[PDB]
């Protein structure tokens, strides 16, 4: 009903507390979702059905049926949550005589409740009310047993005393025992008394709240008994809970002023986010025989870089991986796919590892640098939040089933190398610190993105004598994607409309197929359990890599080795997996051959570089349309009429134009002979490309 | 839980209060009304009915009362107690008691054995010495003394008799325990 006085000791009352109690009964048998839809017997029907002993009651509801409990509810939510529960177990056990053996005791969660206070704003007046908050949680206890229904040992007569409620704010401390009469010690009957899930978590203001300059503010939470392990330390959550004061924290010991200490006691948790197992193979299914999923798939990663298609390539085929294989037990070949990024500032290079930490699930991300959560080198130590003695494994095997993504890779310590020189290698750690000598296991995948020598990459030099990494640690990489940086005026106005325009979408105050979106992306990036397998054709891999051996000692280079062949194995089978094909066909090989040798090439300097791409353009340009082959020439053409221009002139004429000749010539070499698809090309007009044919010149308007 | 009924007591209080407002004397009138008038007054607390009237009206309820006099008693005294509240303005806190008188048949001394333990007879003896009239503690409020909580109407069986246990669940007191005499009821007592 109403009040005569204070509202606590109101619903305390006897009178008012059974009318609250029959008009909550009366609320969960009577509420209809607008639509006849009969809300609450039908969740305590699935609640019960899966066993959850917890109601969410959304306020918005209780209000609108019945406002005075509604009323009620924040001013005294100890009394008016405790005849809540009480109802409910009523209601339950109605619906369902046989749900008293599974809970006996409903929890009732009010959801949706308008009183949303930050954590800076509670003061003395919200004390022993219903508040809101929101944050973000920053530690987590381990679910601890807290007593419930304690029974205690006389430990003098060995009589078990009977079942006490455990209150959260003052220890139980038993009396006299009923039998011997006894003051004397006690102790729990740890097998007689009956325990709660209790988890406490510190939960702050989120940094994005906090704005004038100045600090967040944090307060403790209790979790009891269905919400513990709701929360995790990272999770921005919205909690409703008693803004509570009078435990045993009243600073009496003379320390200072008499302040209280305050905690909140959760009683609902609202996590801000989605919520990772696939109930709908079919999709996939029907995505992998599009007969262009590969294709879709490179384009669908990092979607917010432009460009940069050979690296797109590399990571999604260490993102689907190979397949380990270990002949005997005594043979270990991983499948795990390595990339390294090496390229000169300001190409993407950090971009790509951060999209492949929001794709990749188990991805961790790390840096050569000190400036990382978690680091590459496992130690163990007291841990600074827990102070809890912990083997704090290294970021190499956090990653075990999953990828570790190594920022500036190049600037790590000598003990950060060897430690990814041992996980890179062995795919383990060893451990032996502090009586500890264990051996555990990293079978990651490792991206790593580091930077030349010198901050610009030289291709006068070879690979490895631009980027400041021992041999070893480079021979663990199965692709290394040289990320040159050039001036080209197309591909400058091309990323330059990409990057403002993602300014002017992103202000505050709002290449031939389609990106498969990532959400899908990641479900079928979760179709790498199909296990998969080979049986084709060895006699062109192993003439090809003859011939590769001859090239490669014929120059200079950077040999050719078994390494590159069982590299281009696994590249094999995670283009097979890609398309899901549960076998390698020939292109699957083709593609990897491709990967390989663009990666090989490359790395060689300019000259043995060249030399073997002439030589094995038959290779470097499988799944190539012709007209991107042309569009490379007709560029490179341009681009050394346009050095020509820069340095007689010193400017460079606008409009620049090349004779039909050199091109024709050019295509020759490659043997297209058909132009007329190139200039009639949507790729030749996207590049700001035409040509006269009157005047018998191609020309390029900037 | 509920407080379980003694269904046989609760029965004869009602048939004794039904024989109290209902049974009438010679003349036509209802006499035992005309007798708690007399218990209005103050130092006025016992309705003295005959046991013939009350074979003649139920005879069922006076064979119930004879065989189980003790465990019935206070019923009777609470049914009287209803029976003049509504008819006067008696003091709220008055206790009213019943005596029976005229039982057709008398015991002999030598025969009150263990079998009429509690139930209602009628005995003839010599008065040799009889005692001072003293108050009698009927039932006791105590305050435990560890934990301050009244336990109130504790019934005393003819000795002084503390609660068993503290009405505090975590207080398993059940030694010290203090008598509070002025919330506590008392009966004139005097043994010859
Ligand atoms: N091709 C591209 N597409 C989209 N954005 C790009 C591209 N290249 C660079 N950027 C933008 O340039 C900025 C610099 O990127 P990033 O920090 O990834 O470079 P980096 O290679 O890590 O440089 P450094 O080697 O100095 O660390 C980023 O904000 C990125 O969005
Ligand atoms: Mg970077
Ligand atoms: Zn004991
Ligand atoms: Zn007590």
Redesign the interface.
């Known amino acids: 009903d109403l009040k005569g006085h204070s509202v606590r000791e109101w619903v305390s009352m006897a009178g008012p507390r059974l009318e609250i109690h029959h008009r909550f009964k009366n609320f969960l048998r009577t509420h209809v979702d607008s639509h006849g839809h009969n809300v609450f017997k039908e969740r305590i029907s699935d609640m019960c059905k899966e066993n959850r002993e917890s109601l969410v009651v959304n306020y918005e509801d209780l209000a609108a049926r019945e406002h005075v409990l509604a009323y009620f509810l924040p001013e005294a939510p100890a009394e008016l949550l405790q005849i809540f529960d009480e109802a409910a177990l009523e209601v339950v056990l109605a619906m369902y005589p046989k749900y008293d053996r599974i809970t006996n005791h409903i929890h009732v969660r009010i959801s949706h409740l308008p009183l949303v206070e930050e954590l800076r704003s509670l003061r003395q007046l919200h004390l022993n009310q219903l508040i809101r908050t929101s944050g973000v949680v920053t530690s987590c206890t381990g679910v601890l047993p807290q007593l419930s229904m304690v029974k205690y040992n006389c430990n003098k007569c060995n009589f078990v005393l009977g079942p006490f409620c455990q209150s959260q704010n003052q220890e139980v401390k038993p009396g006299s025992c009923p039998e011997c009469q006894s003051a004397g010690p006690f102790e729990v009957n740890m097998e007689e008394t009956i325990y709660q899930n209790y988890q406490r978590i510190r939960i702050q203001e989120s940094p994005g709240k906090v704005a004038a300059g100045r600090l967040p503010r944090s307060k403790d939470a209790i979790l009891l008994a269905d919400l513990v392990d709701s929360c995790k330390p990272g999770d921005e959550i919205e909690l409703t809970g008693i803004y509570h004061n009078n435990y045993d924290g009243s600073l009496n010991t003379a320390n200072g002023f008499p302040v209280f200490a305050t905690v909140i006691l959760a009683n609902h948790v609202a996590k801000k986010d989605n919520k990772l197992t696939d109930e709908d193979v079919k999709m996939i299914t029907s995505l992998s025989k599009d007969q262009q999923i590969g294709e879709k798939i490179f384009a669908s990663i990092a979607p917010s870089i432009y460009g940069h298609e050979d690296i797109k390539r590399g990571l999604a085929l260490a993102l689907f991986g190979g397949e380990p294989k270990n002949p005997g037990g005594k043979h270990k070949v991983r499948g795990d796919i390595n990339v390294l990024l090496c390229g000169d500032p300001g190409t993407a290079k950090s971009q790509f590892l951060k999209y492949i930490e929001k794709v990749s699930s188990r991805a961790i991300f790390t840096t050569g640098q000190g400036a990382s959560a978690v680091g590459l080198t496992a130690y163990v130590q007291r841990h600074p939040v827990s102070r809890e003695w912990t083997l704090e494994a290294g970021a190499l095997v956090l990653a075990d089933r999953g990828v570790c993504l190594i920022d500036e890779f190049d600037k790590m310590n000598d003990q950060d190398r060897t430690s990814i020189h041992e996980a890179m290698e062995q795919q383990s750690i060893s451990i032996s610190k502090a009586g500890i000598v264990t051996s555990l296991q990293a079978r990651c995948t490792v991206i790593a993105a580091a930077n030349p020598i010198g901050g610009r990459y030289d291709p006068s030099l070879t690979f490895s004598e631009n980027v400041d990494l021992t041999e070893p640690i480079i021979s663990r990489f199965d692709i290394l994607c040289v990320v040159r940086d050039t001036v080209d005026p197309v591909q400058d106005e091309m990323l330059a409309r990409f990057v403002v325009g993602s300014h002017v979408r992103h202000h505050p105050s709002n290449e031939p197929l389609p990106q498969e979106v990532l959400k899908k992306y990641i479900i079928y990036a979760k179709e790498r359990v199909h296990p998969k397998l080979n049986q084709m054709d060895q006699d062109k891999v192993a003439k090809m890599y003859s011939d590769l051996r001859k090239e490669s000692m014929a120059t200079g280079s950077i040999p050719i080795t078994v390494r590159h062949i069982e590299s281009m194995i696994r590249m094999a089978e995670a283009h097979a997996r890609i398309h899901l094909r549960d076998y390698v066909i020939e292109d699957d090989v083709n593609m990897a051959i491709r990967v390989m040798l663009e990666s090989f090439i490359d790395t060689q300097k300019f000259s043995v570089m060249r030399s073997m791409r002439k030589t094995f353009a038959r290779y470097l340009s499988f799944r190539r349309d012709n007209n991107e082959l042309l569009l490379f020439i007709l560029k490179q053409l341009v681009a050394e009429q346009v050095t020509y221009q820069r340095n007689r002139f010193g400017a460079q004429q606008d409009t620049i134009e090349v004779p039909e000749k050199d091109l024709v010539d050019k295509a020759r070499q490659i043997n297209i002979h058909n132009l007329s698809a190139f200039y009639d090309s949507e790729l030749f007009r996207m590049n700001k490309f035409s040509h006269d044919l009157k005047r018998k010149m191609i020309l390029q308007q900037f | 839980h509920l407080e379980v009924r003694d269904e046989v007591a609760e029965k004869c209080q009602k048939l004794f209060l039904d024989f109290l407002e209902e049974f009438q004397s010679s003349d036509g009138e209802i006499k035992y009304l005309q007798l708690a008038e007399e218990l209005i007054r103050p130092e006025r607390n016992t309705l003295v009915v005959s046991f013939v009237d009350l074979e003649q009206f139920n005879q069922q309820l006076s064979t119930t009362i004879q065989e189980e006099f003790y465990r019935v008693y206070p019923y009777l005294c609470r049914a009287l107690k209803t029976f003049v509240k509504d008819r006067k303005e008696i003091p709220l806190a008055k206790d009213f008691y019943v005596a029976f008188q005229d039982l057709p048949t008398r015991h002999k001394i030598r025969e009150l054995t263990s079998s009429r333990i509690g139930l209602l007879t009628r005995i003839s003896g010599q008065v040799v010495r009889t005692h001072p009239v003293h108050p009698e503690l009927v039932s006791g409020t105590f305050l435990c003394l ?2 301050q909580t009244v336990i109130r109407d504790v019934e005393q069986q003819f000795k002084y008799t503390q609660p068993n ?2 009405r ?8 010290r325990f203090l008598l509070d005499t002025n919330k506590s009821r008392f009966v004139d007592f005097q043994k010859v």
Request: charge should be positive; glycine fraction near 0%.
């Open positions: 560890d934990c246990i503290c505090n669940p975590v207080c398993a007191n059940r030694r």
